[PDB]
Amino acid sequence: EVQWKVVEESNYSYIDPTQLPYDHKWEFPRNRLSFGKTLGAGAFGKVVEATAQGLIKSDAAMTVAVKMLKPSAHSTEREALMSELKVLSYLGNHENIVNLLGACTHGGPTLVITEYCCYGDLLNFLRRKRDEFVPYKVPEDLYKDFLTLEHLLSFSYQVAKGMAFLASKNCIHRDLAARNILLTHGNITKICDFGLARDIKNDSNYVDKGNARLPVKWMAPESIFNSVYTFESDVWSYGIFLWELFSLGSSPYPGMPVDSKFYKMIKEGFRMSSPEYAPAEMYDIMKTCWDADPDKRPTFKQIVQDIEKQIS
Ligand SMILES: COC(=O)c1ccc2c(c1)NC(=O)/C2=C(\Nc1ccc(N(C)C(=O)CN2CCN(C)CC2)cc1)c1ccccc1
């Protein structure tokens, strides 16, 4: 919205990602990329499955995901893709994020080489295993490839470790949701920012507010109503993700259209109830994540230590 704002005294401010350095150690020869099918495409950017010759081991090739722009992209999009590469180069490597493997910044359009996660996004994975879920396995043949409570607990734990990594790098996600979590071999979940590769206009999970489209049902109140995005507001989005996880990919606040009454109810203390398969101690974490006071929400470092005792 382009309007007036009354302000009150309360810090952190975004950095201009174009000012971040790009380390050319990530430069990978473009001629060693063999492109496959497009995995997903936004309005201006797309992620393509590809084969990278000698990227990690000089002997053999490996499947990777290459993030690139469409022909319709303008100079601002090309700057944005370069800034996304500069952020990934800045953050460093962690197991629970979609990591940067290389980049092609020469001899053509910019190609960002990321890890390929064979299972896709966690949201579609959960909704696919809905009829194949049991809390724990009793004859094991009947639950061959079943999803269990052990898996969901590991997912909550890995996403929390990934977010804890981002917070330690002074990085705010601002769009934490199951659709932005990817699953790869060994049930490893990886956080990522789709950025230019998700078409926000065609996704009902992003609500048209003014001129912007925001993931309202995942956002903390101070984000929706005060435009305040912090480490603590990410924790709110993690609580909404937990509700997705233990409802097996159900849309949050199911059956509630986003309108003025919805915003009012959230401000007055309205919260979702416990998912059907959520353990009690995990739902406790949800309620703390959804505290209207950002000071009373747990940090991701605390969430990691909390879930760790549950795993053990
Ligand atoms: C910063 O990094 C990023 O921003 C980023 C963004 C997306 C991906 C990524 C990095 N890394 C991946 O791997 C991504 C996806 N990968 C994938 C894998 C498997 C599938 N599935 C299940 C298929 O069936 C498709 N596919 C399987 C393999 N055969 C050969 C071809 C058909 C679908 C998507 C994917 C992309 C679009 C939307 C959701 C996820």
From Swiss-Prot:
Which organism is this entry from?
Homo sapiens (Human)
Q: What highest taxon heads this organism's lineage?
A: Eukaryota
Name any Gene Ontology BP term: hematopoietic stem cell migration
Span list, region Important for interaction with phosphotyrosine-binding proteins: 12-14
Q: How does it assemble?
A: Monomer in the absence of bound KITLG/SCF. Homodimer in the presence of bound KITLG/SCF, forming a heterotetramer with two KITLG/SCF molecules. Interacts (via phosphorylated tyrosine residues) with the adapter proteins GRB2 and GRB7 (via SH2 domain), and SH2B2/APS. Interacts (via C-terminus) with MPDZ (via the tenth PDZ domain). Interacts (via phosphorylated tyrosine residues) with PIK3R1 and PIK3 catalytic subunit. Interacts (via phosphorylated tyrosine) with CRK (isoform Crk-II), FYN, SHC1 and MATK/CHK (via SH2 domain). Interacts with LYN and FES/FPS.
Q: What result is annotated for mutating residue 199 to I?
A: In MASTC; somatic mutation; constitutively activated; requires 2 nucleotide substitutions
Question: Related disease?
Answer: Piebald trait: Autosomal dominant genetic developmental abnormality of pigmentation characterized by congenital patches of white skin and hair that lack melanocytes.
The molecular function terms in GO held by this entry are: ATP binding; cytokine binding; growth factor binding; metal ion binding; protease binding; protein homodimerization activity; protein tyrosine kinase activity; SH2 domain binding
- What does the UniProt keyword field contain? ATP-binding, Cell membrane, Cytoplasm, Disease variant, Disulfide bond, Glycoprotein, Immunoglobulin domain, Kinase, Magnesium, Membrane, Metal-binding, Nucleotide-binding, Phosphoprotein, Proto-oncogene, Receptor, Repeat, Signal, Transferase, Transmembrane, Transmembrane helix, Tyrosine-protein kinase, Ubl conjugation
Q: What induces it?
A: Up-regulated by cis-retinoic acid in neuroblastoma cell lines.
* Glycoprotein among keywords: yes
- Consequence the record notes for mutating residue 15 to A: Reduction in SH2B2/APS binding. Abolishes SH2B2/APS binding
- Where are the Phosphotyrosine residues found in this chain? 12, 14, 206, 283
Q: Which residues of the full protein are shown?
A: 554 to 929 of 976
Q: Which residues form the Protein kinase domain?
A: 33-312
The record's function comment reads: Tyrosine-protein kinase that acts as a cell-surface receptor for the cytokine KITLG/SCF and plays an essential role in the regulation of cell survival and proliferation, hematopoiesis, stem cell maintenance, gametogenesis, mast cell development, migration and function, and in melanogenesis. In response to KITLG/SCF binding, KIT can activate several signaling pathways. Phosphorylates PIK3R1, PLCG1, SH2B2/APS and CBL. Activates the AKT1 signaling pathway by phosphorylation of PIK3R1, the regulatory subunit of phosphatidylinositol 3-kinase.
Q: What family is this protein classified in?
A: Belongs to the protein kinase superfamily. Tyr protein kinase family. CSF-1/PDGF receptor subfamily.
Which residues hold ATP? 40-47, 67, 115-121, 179
> Anything else of interest in the record?
Numerous proteins are phosphorylated in response to KIT signaling, but it is not evident to determine which are directly phosphorylated by KIT under in vivo conditions.
GO CC annotation terms, alphabetical: acrosomal vesicle; cell-cell junction; cytoplasmic side of plasma membrane; external side of plasma membrane; extracellular space; fibrillar center; plasma membrane; receptor complex
So where's the catalytic machinery, residue-wise?
A: 175 (proton acceptor)
How is this chain modified after translation?
Ubiquitinated by SOCS6. KIT is rapidly ubiquitinated after autophosphorylation induced by KITLG/SCF binding, leading to internalization and degradation. Autophosphorylated on tyrosine residues. KITLG/SCF binding enhances autophosphorylation. Isoform 1 shows low levels of tyrosine phosphorylation in the absence of added KITLG/SCF (in vitro). Kinase activity is down-regulated by phosphorylation on serine residues by protein kinase C family members. Phosphorylation at Tyr-12 is required for interaction with PTPN11/SHP-2, CRK (isoform Crk-II) and members of the SRC tyrosine-protein kinase family. Phosphorylation at Tyr-14 is required for interaction with PTPN6/SHP-1.
Protein name from the UniProt record? Mast/stem cell growth factor receptor Kit
